[PDB]
Design a protein around this nucleic acid. Structure first.
Ligand SMILES: Nc1ccn([C@H]2C[C@H](O)[C@@H](COP(=O)(O)OP(=O)(O)OP(=O)(O)O)O2)c(=O)n1
Ligand SMILES: [Ca+2]
Ligand SMILES: [Ca+2]
Lengths: 347, 942, 347
DNA sequence: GCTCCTCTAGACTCGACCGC
DNA sequence: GCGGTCGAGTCTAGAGGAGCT
């Protein structure tokens, strides 16, 4: 209700109000995500990629095209594509199990609509299939709860497939009800055996000293629906997005106008060099009350609101307001970068 | 006609069975007794109410040895305890060779014959053994060394982890490292020494039983909790000379006297590393041998004394059997521990994050000075410190660079202003006063964003969560501890007044605090009004916050989600150390029997272990077993982390766990004592009549009637009635009613307690029987004749500690009931070749690990043993009959795991899915007597 | 020619070696990139972001859906729809720009190509000036990473409508191939998509209002990867550190294996947590010849190689080799991370 | 009819250096 | 020379046990 107005004015997702219906967003066909929503999705992708691929010695990226020829229709699931590269990526891991792939892309779900997909097609020996599945569920639920303000809304459900294969589905308790945002299915050897006929000696992995056919496992996660879940969870109008997820970190406004403009430009260059994305606030031509400007910033979920006042030419002290706190501090302009990187690097 | 009826119209035992137990003929009922019972019943209005007779039962009970039931038991107990009392007598008299001056260093057992000569052996090869085993607690749980004595020589055992210095050994245990060994093993607190024996953990029972000198001591000259506390504080006072504490030194002083026992001052086995124990071997071994000899002397001075205070052999034959408790687990135990610990950590992190969010969202009240209106955060510090000081076209290629370097140098020259900054940086001067303390200093290497130093125990967390007691905001004062304000920087009494309207008598309207517009009632501490609570998050307040009295006030999500997290993790916090440290020995598949290794439910990749509880077979003056981990009142609550541990005790494949719960055994024991004392027939006491003809479904039993009378929950009324039976006075009931209902005052609680205890009454002839058997010169149990503790006999402690003894009568009667059940079950198992063994005796429950093919025969045997036990109680009390209703089990459980019901799915935050979804445990069968007879054809034998 | 063997064997591209067709590579209908190729494309996209959208004040991210039963012709039409929407992100102050990294569709019938399209809603007066500005900046950016910036070439071409256009090129060994193109399309597309209603078409450029003449700058990141790969190519692929997918490789010498593995794991975690991509070469039980190991690491464009041996247990000195100078040196553990960061930043 | 020990965490205090 | 933190030190309150390690 009220959230979609905030998510529209602050350009999280654009389009006319008639287009922003829950059915449109959930189905996968919607007009598009605005720049701040794009940056939130980028931050979510970065955090997922870190926690999944970066701090792992056996996880590799993969590339699946948006099209699927043969039996001509666009793609609907990324897992069906990641399985094709399995035999190719075994050379990198010298056939050492367990190992898996990863990819973040756009998959089109017929309703035509598309969803930003995240995949963790993960291969384990059959001996530890149940243990690896349980560990990955315990890890992915923790990952989803990590950035969330209300972990209890995120949940886990155990399910069995038509063949009785053990699997788990994650949900976010949206205001209207639970919605699937991740599915961990122990597909077994069915998909790989079907895709790769003939001798199955090509698929063998070095489970210790035993060569055994891998037991796949897909952790498909919808990043568009996950981003919408975080935008509903975050929600005085504020969006308490996790400091590692907020799209814009600092709103470098400006308080002699030319000298302050030069200082703001220097600081803007300084912060951007260290990865702290900035929102230029020294380009407006409309004076506004600080309360109104702040309430404009809070909807954007800006971690800090730097203000390079006139006095900074004398002693170099700049105002700094934090979203969550609501209290402002006067920190020396030389120590700004270290404090910001320390605050957003704890994770 | 199988139907029978006593003159009180209670359906007695079926004629087909009564003749097989109490014999034919019987005795005619006395007219005077019948008239008195009828008048007593119609006095309470219970006379004339009809109950539909239960379907009569016909069975072929096995032949009863001896002339009657009492002689039958005695014969059973004698034939069970003879081969172990023979070894006990062989060990009581012995010419033990002198202790070896120097002990050997080889592995395994070594034999020290005459004059200290060392000889290596593989097994002690002796029936009797006084046994003590020491473990290096720092290294792990594997036994380090053990010293044992037999009537022929001395023995010692040194493990591989002490003899041989090698790389790290496997953390997971196995029978390959434990102590190799009819037999009898005597020790002090032998349960500890029991768990380190290799052959104990094998599923098939090795015929060896353990005698604990501490159990004998607690049976002979034990002390109650109050008496123990008085004895410890000091050291009508003669009982100190005859009783002592459970410490081996104190017991040795009491039963032997003389030089004090040698106690190690360095405590290498508890604290020192493996090197220290290796170096001090010749001293620790002598200490262990001295402890062994002290235990031997206490055993010599106890065993002849013990058998003269428990003359009936059933008591000893059961005590030998209650010491072989066996809890089989599987690979689900390790996963249970992991999942529980991980969930506990995640819930703690979520609670910490919710507290941090509550702190962050509270700083906003500084703006506009609205914090003066918040009922909770007004008292904090909110002052701030000052930061004291000591279109134009595209730019060409050169213009961009010159503008960038101009901006850079304009910024760079501001670095020179570092002089004005103080050398020691300030710590967040723009944030309020209370918020600075919670934030770690920027200089600190362990800095974490936000108020990282916030925790439950602090004086500000009960303020951020806006905790409300009965809707009243909490408040802390230094001189009075934590309390709450009742409405009616200046404290915003107006906001507190408004808050309570949306949502009085207490622990005292303290006016020495003077919070304006309010009265500061303290929180009711568990130690009385004289003490002051330091934390409203204490374990004593869990029922209060689960009752809805202690809420998080104004809804803000984080508030409650925290409080509920604290309620959810209220159990695992206290028991994670104990449950995670349980000694599990994973049996290798080469030691598993063919029944388990050749069953469809067997898993080739699973590990089946066996947790042997360190139960004290006589853990109190009342001789009931004591074990804090297992033998406690607990269940898989829907909102409790890690509460499904009992559901994790899963029988191995091919085996099932045929157990049953006795229905109100303590109540019915009280009722049978009362009716035996009053008129000599069942139901002659109104309490007995309501215990027999009462219906839980119809709400006629004592619990439901009391709950209706005093208007409290049935769970409160259960504890109330069990306390009332245990001899608790009026003041105890007043305290219980005050704790259960805060609104009730002292006068109302006193009046209600007195009225409830005024009910000659419905139970007077029961209390008179209990007192007349506790004020006697030698209080003995009315069934097996077990004697009371020497620290309680009226000769020694006249006039005081009566309540302990009146409770002891009922509790030791229940223990006698349990011993009779164990003896009868063992006899049935041995005679009819029912392949099974004892598993656990949690409270009144009795579980047996029986083979799968004999689950129904085991159920029939359990029903028969219950019938025989109740008949034996009636026989000893002098009734020679038994009502049909209590003549059998209501339902005998046959399930794959320990569980209060065979229908519980055990949904806990640890395993939200349930038992069947993940662990694969299906539901069990609850069989009444008729289904058991239909399935078994009525005959135990195959 | 032999470069394509290196890319596939070292997992830059994907597919069989027999289907490595140049036209498929240059037309977007190739089977897909490998893991290292995916990371190289991500590095390029990140550098393009830092150079076009990060260090600017009026450039913002947008995205448009692939479909519209046929997909989108170009990424431009989404920006033309955001024109009304994004005219509030810059507070209506013309000019303003939009940039995007997204898949365009080229029937070689379906094909996938990701374009770095940049649109600039400049006023009619300064359209040529900003066209030259973007041309110069794009040529600078494409020449910055190049080992030989002379191969990159530009040109000026006239279209049928009299709108000047600039076409960039790379001097591939077979010939000159287009990698970027610029067009001064004008206001025809915006007027056609929004006939009439001049209130939306005009923005505050100066004090007056005006309808901007769009400028289209479109460079193929997928083809820029090929251009830079051919720029690099003993066997060696020297690359700028801002583009190389994986930068440092860890190894183990002689025994004992356990403590060497522990120290290598600690070093790997230390390097990762500081944002340096590391190849976990210490997990392999069998260490091959140092020459072939270093050759393999060189073929992955790995900047530095670390060989932790038993000497590190005695004094801590390790072996550090740079591919550019193939000279070894000794350094303690605590200095390796600082040296890696300094080498990455300085270039 | 109701306390002993040890062990851990939170809170207030005084004495002491040091930067202004 | 004088105020502003900073670190022992003690007090209080709670929590584990009343064995044996
Ligand atoms: N204040 C109390 C209440 C109970 N118990 C003991 C006596 C019981 O035998 C045992 C088990 O209690 P349960 O309530 O679980 O078993 P019941 O059969 O008595 O419950 P109910 O009568 O409601 O069916 O706990 C106790 O020691 N002190
Ligand atoms: Ca012992
Ligand atoms: Ca019961």
């Amino acid at each position: 209700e009220a959230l979609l107005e905030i998510c529209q004015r602050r350009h999280f997702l654009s389009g006319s109000k008639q287009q922003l219906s829950r059915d449109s967003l959930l189905s996968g066909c919607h007009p598009g995500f605005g720049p701040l929503g794009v940056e939130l999705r980028k931050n979510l992708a970065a955090e997922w990629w870190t926690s999944v691929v970066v701090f792992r010695e056996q996880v590799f990226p993969v590339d699946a095209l948006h099209h699927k020829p043969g039996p001509g229709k666009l793609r609907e699931n990324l897992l069906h594509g990641a399985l094709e590269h399995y035999v190719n990526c075994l050379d990198l891991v010298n056939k050492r199990l367990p190992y898996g792939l990863a990819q973040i892309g756009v998959c089109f779900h017929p309703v035509i609509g598309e969803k930003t997909e995240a995949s963790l097609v993960w291969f384990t020996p059959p001996r530890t299939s149940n243990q690896w599945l349980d560990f990955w569920l315990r890890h992915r639920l923790q990952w989803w709860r990590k950035f969330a303000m209300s972990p209890s809304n995120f949940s886990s459900s155990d399910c069995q497939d038509e063949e009785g294969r053990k699997g788990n589905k994650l949900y976010y308790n949206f205001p209207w009800g639970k919605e699937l945002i991740e599915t961990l299915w122990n597909l077994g050897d069915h998909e790989l055996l079907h895709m790769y006929p003939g001798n199955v000696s090509k698929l063998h992995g070095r489970d210790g000293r035993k060569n055994v056919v891998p037991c796949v496992l897909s952790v498909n996660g919808d990043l568009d629906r996950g981003m919408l879940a975080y935008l509903y969870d975050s929600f005085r109008k504020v969006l308490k997005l996790h400091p590692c997820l907020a799209p814009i970190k600092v709103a470098l406004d400006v308080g002699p106008t030319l000298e302050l403009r030069q200082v703001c430009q220097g600081l803007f260059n300084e912060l951007l060099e260290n990865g702290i994305s900035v929102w230029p606030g020294y380009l407006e031509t409309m004076q506004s009350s600080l309360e109104q400007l702040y309430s404009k910033y809070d909807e954007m979920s800006i971690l800090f609101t730097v203000l390079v006042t006139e006095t900074t030419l004398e002693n170099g002290l700049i105002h700094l307001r934090s979203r969550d706190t609501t209290m402002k501090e006067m920190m020396h302009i030389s120590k700004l970068k270290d404090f910001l990187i320390k605050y957003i690097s704890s994770a | 006609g199988q139907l029978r009826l006593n003159p009180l119209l209670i359906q007695m035992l079926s004629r087909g069975l009564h003749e097989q137990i109490f014999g034919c003929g019987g005795e005619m009922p006395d007219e005077a007794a019948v008239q008195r019972s009828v008048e007593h019943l119609q006095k309470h209005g219970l006379w004339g109410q009809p109950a539909t007779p239960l379907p009569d039962v016909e069975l072929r009970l096995p032949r009863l040895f001896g002339g009657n039931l009492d002689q039958h038991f005695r014969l059973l107990a004698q034939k069970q305890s003879l081969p172990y009392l023979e070894a006990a007598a062989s060990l009581l008299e012995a010419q033990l060779p002198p202790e070896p001056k120097s002990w050997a260093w080889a592995e395994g057992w070594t034999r020290y014959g005459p004059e200290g000569e060392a000889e290596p052996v593989a097994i002690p090869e002796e029936r009797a053994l006084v046994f003590d085993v020491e473990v290096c607690l720092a290294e792990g749980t594997c036994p380090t060394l053990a010293v044992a004595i037999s009537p022929s020589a001395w023995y010692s055992w040194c493990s591989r982890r002490l003899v041989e210095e090698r790389y790290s050994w496997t953390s997971q245990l196995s029978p390959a490292d434990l102590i190799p060994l009819e037999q009898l093993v005597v020790g002090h607190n032998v349960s500890f020494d029991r768990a380190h024996i290799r052959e104990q953990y094998l599923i098939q029972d090795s015929r060896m039983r353990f005698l604990d000198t501490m159990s004998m001591h607690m049976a002979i000259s034990g002390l109650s909790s109050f008496q123990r506390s008085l004895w410890m504080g000091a050291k009508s006072w003669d009982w100190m000379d005859i009783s002592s504490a459970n410490n081996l030194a104190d017991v040795h002083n009491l039963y032997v006297g003389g030089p004090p026992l040698e106690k190690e001052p360095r405590e290498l086995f508890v604290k020192g590393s493996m090197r220290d124990i290796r170096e001090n071997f010749q001293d620790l071994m002598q200490y262990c041998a001295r402890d062994v000899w002290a235990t031997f002397e206490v055993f010599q001075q106890q065993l002849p004394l013990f058998l003269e205070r428990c003359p009936h052999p059933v008591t000893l034959a059961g005590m030998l059997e209650m010491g072989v408790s066996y809890l089989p687990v599987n690979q689900n135990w390790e996963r249970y521990l992991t999942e529980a610990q991980n969930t506990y950590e995640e819930l703690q992190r979520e609670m910490k994050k919710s507290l941090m969010d509550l702190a962050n969202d509270a700083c906003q009240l500084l703006s506009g000075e609205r914090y003066k209106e918040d009922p909770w955060l007004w008292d904090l510090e909110w002052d701030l410190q000052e930061f004291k000081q000591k279109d134009p076209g595209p730019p060409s290629e050169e213009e961009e660079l010159q503008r960038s370097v101009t901006a850079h140098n304009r910024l760079q020259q501001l670095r020179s202003t570092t002089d004005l900054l103080p050398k020691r940086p300030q710590h967040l001067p723009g944030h309020p006063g209370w918020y600075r303390k919670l934030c770690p200093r920027l200089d600190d290497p362990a800095w974490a964003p936000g108020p990282s130093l916030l925790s439950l125990q602090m004086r500000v967390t009960p303020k951020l969560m806006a905790l409300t007691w009965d809707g009243f905001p909490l408040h802390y004062s230094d001189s009075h501890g934590w309390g709450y304000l009742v409405p009616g920087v200046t404290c915003p009494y107006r906001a507190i007044e408004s808050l309570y309207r949306k949502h009085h008598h207490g622990n005292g309207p303290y006016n020495d605090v003077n919070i304006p517009g309010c009265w500061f009632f303290k929180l009711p501490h568990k130690d009385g009004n004289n003490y002051n609570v330091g934390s409203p998050f204490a374990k004593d307040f869990l029922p209060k916050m689960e009752d809805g009295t202690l809420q998080a006030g104004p809804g803000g999500a984080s508030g409650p989600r925290a409080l509920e997290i604290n309620k959810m993790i209220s159990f695992w916090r206290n028991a994670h150390k104990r449950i995670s440290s349980q000694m599990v020995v994973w049996l290798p598949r080469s030691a598993l029997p063919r029944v388990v290794t050749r069953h469809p439910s067997f898993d080739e990749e699973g590990h089946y272990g066996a947790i042997l509880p360190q139960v004290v077979t006589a853990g109190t003056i009342t001789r009931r077993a004591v074990e804090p981990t297992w033998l406690t009142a607990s269940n898989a609550r829907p909102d409790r982390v890690g509460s499904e541990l009992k559901a994790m005790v899963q029988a191995p494949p091919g085996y099932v766990l045929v157990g049953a719960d006795v229905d109100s055994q303590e109540l019915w024991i009280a009722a049978v004592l009362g009716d035996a004392h009053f008129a000599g027939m069942h139901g002659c006491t109104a309490f007995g009549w309501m215990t027999l003809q009462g219906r839980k479904s119809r709400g006629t039993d004592l619990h439901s009637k009391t709950a209706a009378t005093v208007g409290i929950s049935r769970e409160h009324a259960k504890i109330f009635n069990y306390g009332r039976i245990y001899g608790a006075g009026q003041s105890f009931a007043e305290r219980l009613l005050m704790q259960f209902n805060h609104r009730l005052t002292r006068q109302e609680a006193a009046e209600k307690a007195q009225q409830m205890y005024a009910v000659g009454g419905t139970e007077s002839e029961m209390f008179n029987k209990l007192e007349s058997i506790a004020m006697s010169d030698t209080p003995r149990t009315p069934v097996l004749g077990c004697c009371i503790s020497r620290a309680l006999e009226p000769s020694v402690v006249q006039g005081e500690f009566i309540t302990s003894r009146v409770n002891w009568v009922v509790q030791s009667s229940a223990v006698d009931y349990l011993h009779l059940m164990l003896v009868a079950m063992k006899w049935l198992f041995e005679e009819f070749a029912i392949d099974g063994r004892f598993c656990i005796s949690i409270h009144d429950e009795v579980r047996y690990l029986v083979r799968e093919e004999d689950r129904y025969r085991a159920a029939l045997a359990l029903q028969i043993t219950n019938l025989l036990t109740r008949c034996m109680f009636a026989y000893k009390l002098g009734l020679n009959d038994l009502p049909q209703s209590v003549a059998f089990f209501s339902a005998v459980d046959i399930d794959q795991c320990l569980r209060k019901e065979v229908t519980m799915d055990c949904k806990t935050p640890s395993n939200p899915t349930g038992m069947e979804r993940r662990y694969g445990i299906p539901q069990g069968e609850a069989l009444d007597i008729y289904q058991i007879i239909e399935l078994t054809k009525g005959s135990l034998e195959k």
